[PDB]
Amino acid sequence: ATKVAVAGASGYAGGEILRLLLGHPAYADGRLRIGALTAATSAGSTLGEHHPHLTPLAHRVVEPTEAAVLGGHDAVFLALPHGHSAVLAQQLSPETLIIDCGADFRLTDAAVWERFYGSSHAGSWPYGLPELPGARDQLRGTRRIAVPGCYPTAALLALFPALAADLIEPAVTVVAVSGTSGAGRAATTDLLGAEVIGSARAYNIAGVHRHTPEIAQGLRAVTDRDVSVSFTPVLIPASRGILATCTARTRSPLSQLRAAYEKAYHAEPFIYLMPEGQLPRTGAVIGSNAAHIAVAVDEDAQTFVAIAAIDNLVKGTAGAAVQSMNLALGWPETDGLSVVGVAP
Amino acid sequence: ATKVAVAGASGYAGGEILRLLLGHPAYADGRLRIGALTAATSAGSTLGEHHPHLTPLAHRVVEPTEAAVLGGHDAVFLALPHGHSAVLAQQLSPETLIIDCGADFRLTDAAVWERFYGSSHAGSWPYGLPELPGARDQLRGTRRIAVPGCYPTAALLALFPALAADLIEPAVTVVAVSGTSGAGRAATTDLLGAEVIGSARAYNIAGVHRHTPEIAQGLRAVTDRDVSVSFTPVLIPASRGILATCTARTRSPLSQLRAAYEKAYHAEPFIYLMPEGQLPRTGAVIGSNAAHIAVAVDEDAQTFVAIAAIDNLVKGTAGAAVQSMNLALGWPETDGLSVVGVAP
Amino acid sequence: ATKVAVAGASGYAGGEILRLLLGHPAYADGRLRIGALTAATSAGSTLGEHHPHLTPLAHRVVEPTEAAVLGGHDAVFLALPHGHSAVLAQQLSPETLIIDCGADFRLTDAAVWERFYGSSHAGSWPYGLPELPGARDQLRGTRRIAVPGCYPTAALLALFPALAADLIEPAVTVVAVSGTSGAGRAATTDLLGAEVIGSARAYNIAGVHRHTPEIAQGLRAVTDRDVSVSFTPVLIPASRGILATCTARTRSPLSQLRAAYEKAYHAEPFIYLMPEGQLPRTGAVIGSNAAHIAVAVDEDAQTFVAIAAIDNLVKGTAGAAVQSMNLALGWPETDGLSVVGVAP
Amino acid sequence: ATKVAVAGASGYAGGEILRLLLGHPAYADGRLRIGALTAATSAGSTLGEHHPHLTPLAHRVVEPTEAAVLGGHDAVFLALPHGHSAVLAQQLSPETLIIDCGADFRLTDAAVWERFYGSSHAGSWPYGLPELPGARDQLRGTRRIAVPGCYPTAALLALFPALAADLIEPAVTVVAVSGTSGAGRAATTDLLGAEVIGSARAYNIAGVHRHTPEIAQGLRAVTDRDVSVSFTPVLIPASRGILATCTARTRSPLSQLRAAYEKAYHAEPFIYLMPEGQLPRTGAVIGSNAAHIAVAVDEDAQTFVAIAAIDNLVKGTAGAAVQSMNLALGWPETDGLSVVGVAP
Ligand SMILES: NC(=O)c1ccc[n+]([C@@H]2O[C@H](COP(=O)([O-])OP(=O)(O)OC[C@H]3O[C@@H](n4cnc5c(N)ncnc54)[C@H](OP(=O)(O)O)[C@@H]3O)[C@@H](O)[C@H]2O)c1
Ligand SMILES: NC(=O)c1ccc[n+]([C@@H]2O[C@H](COP(=O)([O-])OP(=O)(O)OC[C@H]3O[C@@H](n4cnc5c(N)ncnc54)[C@H](OP(=O)(O)O)[C@@H]3O)[C@@H](O)[C@H]2O)c1
Ligand SMILES: COc1ccc2[nH]cc(CC(=O)O)c2c1
Ligand SMILES: COc1ccc2[nH]cc(CC(=O)O)c2c1
Ligand SMILES: COc1ccc2[nH]cc(CC(=O)O)c2c1
Ligand SMILES: COc1ccc2[nH]cc(CC(=O)O)c2c1
């Protein structure tokens, strides 16, 4: 039996983890039990007040986020803002599996963490991107997992096959558009529907976004060159979805690149290379754990270009948390995680 | 090994049926296989060229909609425009399970079919609304099913308990808002995203809309009274969803009306009537076969109010279709049919 | 040269008064100047931090809302829609023209006010709905205006001609779909883009909505009979717009009804009657002071149907404010108000 | 009094042109008169059936697009489907001012035109982008105007000052998100409401887009060096808007770059630099002829970043046309083109 808690269940990330715990085959056959669901200000309320789409768990009472509530669980999902997984994992048994969606344990460079996040660095856990060279090995059987950010996921998948193959220059440029739900359920004026509907805006530009160094970190894991990352995230009128455009100087032929991408991904269950003439679209991956990827070559401009479409709440967080949890617990990697997206 | 065919596979209802089949527990242990996938002018093309979310069936070539093609399939789903299933049915073998998403076999009065469809009445098949009184027994083991339209499913599910209780009057009004997908994939110009985004409009008003008599028909099955229907559809900037507001004169206490809906729906797997103080929203049901329902009384205006939310492609078309296929084959009714919406 | 202040210049209604003044002919030829722009919080900040669409005023420094700062203005807009403003009005000299966007002074029945608001009734001022019978003559030269609510502008305009000609029954049904901008700038989670995008929901149903008596009041102004109102508001992924489906039982012919609406509107320059075979859509009036109206008869249901579309921040709020202000000052009524929408 | 004819009056470009003239001061006093409104297939329709938002022109009868009809007008706008306007162009009088929104007369290099347009090159007319250096001078008194593409307008105003100041390296990247209207009014199934809503997708990537050569061109006009452009457009669920993110390497301080954009843009009425700490957004410029630019520097990436927002129908097409018509006829450059957009 595997009893699972979720800290921050009243937020988007937590809702997305529960939808999938609901659909997990380990749930339907009882090898998985949904234990405690906690929050902060919303403790004492029913979950239907927050997640009216998770009707099976609507009667559940949101408990306070305390080590005393979260003890006695084999697995413990952390879907709260960064800074809390530090203290909170220090309070649980060593053998319980902790899956943190925050950024606390993502970066390996303490000085980068302080420059970008503005707090002390808690260290690093295995990185919940199984598709990354070497990462899958490190998830198998572990008990501490750090889920990647929603932007670094789309980009690394897009870029790492070419940079590891040495078919593109190590200075990359990423311009991603995201749906609103990647900002989180905290009520801020600038994420009101009246404001995002019919309006696009780029934010945190010129390399100040905290995901800039996360993409950098991962690409440096496939190369020995100096890596450079111009990241620019763009907010568009959508609830979910991440469409990441990724360019970098190349002199290799599209022949060689397309072959580079088939090798790295032909056996990946979740990565789907588009047929020629096709190009990813976010709307086709919504609600699925899949990533759609097209590669091309702008030879007039000696520019490689590669597009990834991922759902930011699944492959971008909760799907990667569940996928990492399948590996940590030794269950089939795809348990609970469909590749069939909900469309239109 | 139930071998299934889907005529009109490249349509919205066709892809939603296929999406659902791909997640059916029968497909997973092979008691179900996906067979011919047929269309009209898009025959010869691949399915991924139409449904990029259905990557497991993207390599499939869609064949023409011909008896030779459809034959030798135990179940055939027909997702064509009307005027086609009438002849396709005697052409197929009598023992195949035929399920028409269209309207050709929905209605039971020939004067009404002519008055609204301009063609000859085809007659009548069992109606795909298992929750309607007496429907389940008619579906168990039939081999011919007409699936309800999206709007009648909403209106009926919202009104009939209080009308079968004789607690409201039989002159109901329904104003249902709906996403764009119910209009289907045919490229009209007032369904272009530029004219749909940021605009709402009512169409087919004053009771010329073909769903009006279908609702009238469904409501007449639970009352001996003379029923009248004012029905108004209003298209809104959304890809999925149907919010149906239905009002009727009543002088019954709220308590008795509430009781009549709990008696009607407590044991119903896909019908979830909201806690007191919550109200349905479409986003809560999307991707899922649920209907979220709420009732209230406008004491001043002496008016009952029922609100209903259903996904227009799942519970209004393919979910009902698959739900009735489960019944016609004697499979657990909820198989492949989730009550958990994809939200936000 | 009339000085103009705007109390609550940072919210939506406030920003849309300024947009309209910015493009008002008196503002161009010096007759009109734009004085103090106050707010509760966010005072000390620039207006461009709030309305980056109003670049000309971007430098302006938002001030506190006090009788001090508001004193010394020929006209003062109280843009805290459906809030409170009675206290401010008593700290201003009676010679100052005050146009209140909120509902403090709309209602004519203290008992109804207390019942629906829980406050002491401030009393009543001329209703800013010029097309209403008798409304325009009470605005001419007035020093106190109450701008009507977004929904009752739509419903009154749709319904009163039929009602006044005694061609429909006084028990009416109105269902209105509306964009998120009517909820205001008030930060709240149920109004986040991720929430609103992709979903619809009726809220505040079955009599509880505060515009219900506002609709009753306007109708009782054109009939001596007792009027009930079933009003249902519905949220939709739009930022602006109000499409109101309004119904009442009738026995009068289509021709009698269509004539009544042309007798009432051929002179009114903001009401455009749809040609035979057309229907309102909100997309066609956005950013405009127009109301687009169509009428029909469901003969089977014995039901009148009227559809009206307006912009919820223009003809529904700021447009009514300015249109009435023009009249208050003896300026031409159409000054600065276009009937042409920015579409698609 | 200048008689004007719009050809393509039934399409998005056409109706936005007509919205502008209706608001034009030259229309209000009589120096401008709206004449024949023609379409390719819509002849015999009234204009309201196409543009319900231009109610003042609703009664106009759409005529066929033939030289006989278009003759007798001083100015003639050509909003004809993406090209094939050169025929019509030589069939009108040579003293008749024609503004072409198509692309047939934009390009300079016949070799580049054939490569991207598969057709023989018709020649080049003065580009209708006054902010481009030396461009305003060739528009004064012109009788041949080619309006820029929606995308080049953005990228050029985003990039040209820094390239002209020789501050950035002339290999530039552009990844622009855009609403659906820019694709025009032709009904594909890929522009269907259901499909663009909730989905992003890059299209025509890796240098196949016909705006890439138009971007290279304008940039070639401000520099000695050879310019290569990497242009990615991305469709988003919006109706109007373009948000162009443009990068290139730079070896300058942010200070020099801002000092170049202030130098270029302090005197141009429609180009709005953002206050330090503010970044552009599309919802702010919608319905106006404005363009909001901001520049930054990612020092660790040695990258210059310029963000530009414009309304794709106004500054991107129909506004540019009207603006260039003002210069053509010797009227003030801002006549009929506000800088204040319609938001939220
Ligand atoms: N959203 C995404 O797409 C995404 C992608 C990748 C990673 N993540 C990560 O997932 C985590 C959750 O973000 P979100 O998008 O879900 O935001 P959210 O919707 O607003 O919810 C965040 C959750 O954190 C809880 N919480 C806040 N402060 C807390 C505190 N002191 N103690 C305990 N619980 C607290 C909240 O409970 P209350 O209701 O009581 O406030 C809430 O349930 C973040 O760390 C994020 O980095 C998110
Ligand atoms: N979509 C909904 O929300 C919904 C809900 C409830 C019920 N329904 C019903 O489901 C049915 C399907 O409509 P839809 O929404 O899916 O619209 P749609 O997207 O246009 O689908 C139409 C499908 O039927 C095929 N088709 C068209 N004409 C054909 C012909 N002569 N012969 C054979 N195949 C033909 C088309 O193939 P080609 O590509 O070759 O043209 C296409 O695959 C309708 O009758 C509808 O009333 C729909
Ligand atoms: C707060 O602005 C937003 C809006 C949408 C978003 N989608 C994904 C993110 C990641 C992040 O910046 O945290 C994000 C941020
Ligand atoms: C015609 O535009 C629309 C928009 C949304 C819709 N949902 C369902 C339908 C068709 C119908 O079932 O009548 C429909 C049509
Ligand atoms: C969710 O709350 C909303 C949403 C949209 C709206 N449009 C107009 C209003 C006024 C009101 O309902 O009080 C409104 C309120
Ligand atoms: C072709 O699909 C699209 C979708 C959205 C668009 N917005 C602007 C354009 C102009 C262009 O690319 O020609 C466009 C095209």
Author numbering:
A (entry chain C), B (entry chain D), C (entry chain A), D (entry chain B): 9 to 352
Study authors write:
The L-arginine biosynthesis pathway consists of eight enzymes that catalyse the conversion of L-glutamate to L-arginine, appears to be attractive target for anti-Tuberculosis (TB) drug discovery. In this work, the ligandability of four enzymes of the pathway ArgB, ArgC, ArgD and ArgF is explored using a fragment-based approach. In conclusion, using a fragment-based approach, we have discovered inhibitors that bind to novel sites in ArgB and ArgF and to the active sites of ArgC and ArgD, which in case of ArgB show on target activity against *M. tuberculosis*.
Additionally, structures were solved with 4 fragment binders, occupying either of the two distinct pockets: the substrate-binding ([Fig fig2] and [Fig fig2]) and the NADP(H)-binding pockets ([Fig fig2] and [Fig fig2]). Enzymatic assays revealed that 2 mM NMR322 inhibited ArgC activity by 45% whereas 2 mM NMR571 caused a 37% inhibition. Although the thermal shifts obtained for NADP(H)-binding pocket fragments NMR401 and NMR863 were higher than those for substrate-binding pocket fragments NMR322 and NMR571, the SPR binding response for the latter was better and positively correlated with percentage inhibition of enzymatic activity (**[Table tbl2]**). It is not clear at this point which strategy has the highest potential to result in potent inhibitors.
